[PDB]
């Protein structure tokens, strides 16, 4: 829900990490029109642990949204943005005609029509070299046989559905700094039940202990390497772990 995105040739891909990702607030920002999730599942993302999640923003045509998919080419798919076969990321798209369509036409969004070759996947090039097409040399000047490589969209509100701005956000997953929102529960009283304090899995009765843990430890072991004490990482309080009856 930013103010102004970039064009389709640029990425502006802001890497997000070092924090827990909650994949539930994106559904309360704007009504999306395309929620493809190549590689993963929309519901099954708050459980895996990833190392680096990238996120780019761009505006592309509505007729060509189906062309942004792994193993599929197009007009803007060989020179500006390519999805390889090892690309497993959700492609979220939503129309933005109410914010990126002025009556006099906007020419701020640019796209490339043809390069000298096909660009490699997972690569971004912002070269403004004027295209050299013909049998006569072009000395970096706009002439007859010399063409600019960048072309504008020209989005207008009078154009029908399909030629409108579509802000498509490519969320990627790469492979542990970003994890899912592990939800907690309520601490029960002294009863032999199951417990899991950040990996500490076992059975026993959680009773009020009298120990004094130093402010850098969580759990503790006995003389025989047996976990019988732990501190709840919710509110500072010691808890004894006696074996079940």
């Amino acid at each position, epitope marked *: 829900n930013a103010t102004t995105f970039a064009s389709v040739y640029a990425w502006n891909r802001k890497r997000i990490s070092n924090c827990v990702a909650d994949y539930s607030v994106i559904y309360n920002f704007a009504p999306f029109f395309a929620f493809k999730c190549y590689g993963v599942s929309p519901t099954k993302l708050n459980d895996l642990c990833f190392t680096n999640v990238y996120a780019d923003s761009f505006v592309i045509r509505g007729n060509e949204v189906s062309q942004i998919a792994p193993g599929q080419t197009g007009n803007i798919a060989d020179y500006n943005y390519k999805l390889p076969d090892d690309f497993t990321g959700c492609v979220i798209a939503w129309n933005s005609n109410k914010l990126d369509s002025k009556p006099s036409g906007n020419y701020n969004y640019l796209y490339r029509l043809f390069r000298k070759s096909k660009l490699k996947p997972f690569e971004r090039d912002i070269s403004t070299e004027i295209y050299q097409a013909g*049998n*006569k040399p072009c000395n970096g000047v706009a*002439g007859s*046989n010399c*063409y600019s490589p960048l*072309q504008s969209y020209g989005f207008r509100p009078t154009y029908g559905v399909g030629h409108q701005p579509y802000r498509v956000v490519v969320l990627s997953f790469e492979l542990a700094t970003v994890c899912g929102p592990k939800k907690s529960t309520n601490l029960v009283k002294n009863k032999c039940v199951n417990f899991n304090f950040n990996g500490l899995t076992g059975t026993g009765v959680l009773t009020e202990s009298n120990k004094k843990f130093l402010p850098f430890q969580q759990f503790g072991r006995d003389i025989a390497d047996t976990t019988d004490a732990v501190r709840d990482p919710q509110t500072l309080e010691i808890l004894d772990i006696t074996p079940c009856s």
Partner: single-chain antibody
Amino acid sequence: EIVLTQSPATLSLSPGERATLSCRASQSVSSYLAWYQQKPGQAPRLLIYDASNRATGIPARFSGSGSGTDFTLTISSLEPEDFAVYYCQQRSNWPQYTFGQGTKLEIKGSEVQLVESGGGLVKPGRSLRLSCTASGFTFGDYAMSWFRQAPGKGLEWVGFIRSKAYGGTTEYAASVKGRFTISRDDSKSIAYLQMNSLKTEDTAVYYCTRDRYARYDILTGLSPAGADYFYYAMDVWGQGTTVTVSS
């Protein structure tokens, strides 16, 4: 600033001999010369664009050579219907299409089609607005350019609007700045041209032709040596209206 002048003025060479066409220029222009052959009354017809390859439609009696500050075109055939003025146009400066005083030679002494509108009396109600609707190429993928032809003065430049792809900017000449504003309506396959503040000297015959094809993906695969480059990326002249001035 590049002045293109022709050396011959009135060649009365009878059909069945040779014919030469020399064109010089002050600034050293590259292979960007366009040769027009215009019948009196009809629309101009280009012969050899960029001085490198020929057009489509004219016979093979146009063998020439040359490059730089001089061009040549030796016609070693007769003159069956050579009653037309041989002009020259440069293609180097894009917003500065400049023509020259062609030479008048005499005998002795197709889905591309477009129509225009806008003309008549100009002094009462000094507001004329020409229109340009085409029915050939897909109107919209090509920039819209204009050229006026004054009676007994030669071909002249007016202005243009670039196509929808390469921005919606504009560029005019020095004598049409602040007076000639071109508006495009590619949604309806129409291009307009406002001519407010009209004078007595602006009574020429304007023509709307094609300009650069902003789509260049196809132009790299096909080499400009046949009719393909003439069919996809090529400008063609059309019909024009008349402007009448009085007191």
